[PDB]
Amino acid sequence: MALDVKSRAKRYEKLDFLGEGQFATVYKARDKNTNQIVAIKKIKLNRTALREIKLLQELSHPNIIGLLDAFGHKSNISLVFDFMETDLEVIIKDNSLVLTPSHIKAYMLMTLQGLEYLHQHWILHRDLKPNNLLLDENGVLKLADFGLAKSFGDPNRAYEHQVVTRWYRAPELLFGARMYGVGVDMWAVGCILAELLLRVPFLPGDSDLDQLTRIFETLGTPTEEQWPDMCSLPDYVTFKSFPGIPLHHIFSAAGDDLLDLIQGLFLFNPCARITATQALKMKYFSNRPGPTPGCQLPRPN
Numbered sequence: 001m002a003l004d005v006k007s008r009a010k011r012y013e014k015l016d017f018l019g020e021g022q023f024a025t026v027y028k029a030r031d032k033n034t035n036q037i038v039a040i041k042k043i044k045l046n047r048t049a050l051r052e053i054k055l056l057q058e059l060s061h062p063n064i065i066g067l068l069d070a071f072g073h074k075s076n077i078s079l080v081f082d083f084m085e086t087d088l089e090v091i092i093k094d095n096s097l098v099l100t101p102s103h104i105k106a107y108m109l110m111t112l113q114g115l116e117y118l119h120q121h122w123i124l125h126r127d128l129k130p131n132n133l134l135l136d137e138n139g140v141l142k143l144a145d146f147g148l149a150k151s152f153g154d155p156n157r158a159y160e161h162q163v164v165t166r167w168y169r170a171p172e173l174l175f176g177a178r179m180y181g182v183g184v185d186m187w188a189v190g191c192i193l194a195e196l197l198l199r200v201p202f203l204p205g206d207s208d209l210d211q212l213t214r215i216f217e218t219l220g221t222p223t224e225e226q227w228p229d230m231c232s233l234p235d236y237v238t239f240k241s242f243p244g245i246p247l248h249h250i251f252s253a254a255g256d257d258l259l260d261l262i263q264g265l266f267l268f269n270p271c272a273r274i275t276a277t278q279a280l281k282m283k284y285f286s287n288r289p290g291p292t293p294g295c296q297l298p299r300p301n
């Protein structure tokens, strides 16, 4: 809209290009108004899109990214976020970094406190994956992105990187469910935990059928008893029956406390899948070792 987006915002001054995403070009800028540093996502081109932008501005939580401003004229709109040093994806992929139990517990704690707030305010992230868990210089993790750019943007023609979103995608979504809830985010959270523990993607499927295959050969083929009404899913498909791999054989260093969390995040029935509040009350987070304070979490140099 002309009257709901500012056309100009002269207060931002570009510094350096950061990188190409699927739906945006991101770059580094200084707000001349506060001397602060920001990242601006530039999106090429709608009542709903503006409502989504406004809502995420109105959110306030330590582990949710700040969307600080929005501006743009005709074929473009630009979103101004808190500048974040790194993310869980570069942390995971960095061979120089050692991931202790305390490191992993901290990343999870912060993620789940973010989700809890979102889900408390009746909002689904819908796009959780490592590169959307951002990390500031002081070790604060923030949920970011929210697929805002996807929601209304033309695709980025210069995006050369691998599209990975299906790896974090819950089975009710792969089987075409039209109604869904917090289980969507909880499942991704489990896949992210798995990727912190294994340092590689847990279920890297290369198509939607191969993703379901991978899910079932790893976690087992579910029955309508574990998952009532599964076979009424729109795109439901019958697979080779698989027994699954015991979680303790996958996660060979995990204690019963962490395996309990992982099982809860990966329950097939999306009604039974553990919620963010329940996850945070699990013995895993009251148990030693306790989580690493932000200032001691490993930084990629």
Ligand SMILES: Nc1ncnc2c1ncn2[C@@H]1O[C@H](COP(=O)(O)OP(=O)(O)NP(=O)(O)O)[C@@H](O)[C@H]1O
Pocket: 018, 019, 020, 021, 022, 023, 024, 025, 026, 039, 041, 081, 082, 083, 084, 085, 131, 132, 134, 145, 148, 149, 150
């Ligand atoms: N708040 C931020 N601070 C610093 N860098 C960021 C921030 N947001 C995105 N980036 C960088 O921008 C690049 C990718 O953009 P990002 O938007 O994260 O890609 P995406 O997950 O494909 N989502 P989108 O671009 O909205 O389609 C990466 O090089 C990120 O490090």
Ligand SMILES: [Mg+2]
Pocket: 021, 131, 132, 145
């Ligand atoms: Mg992103």
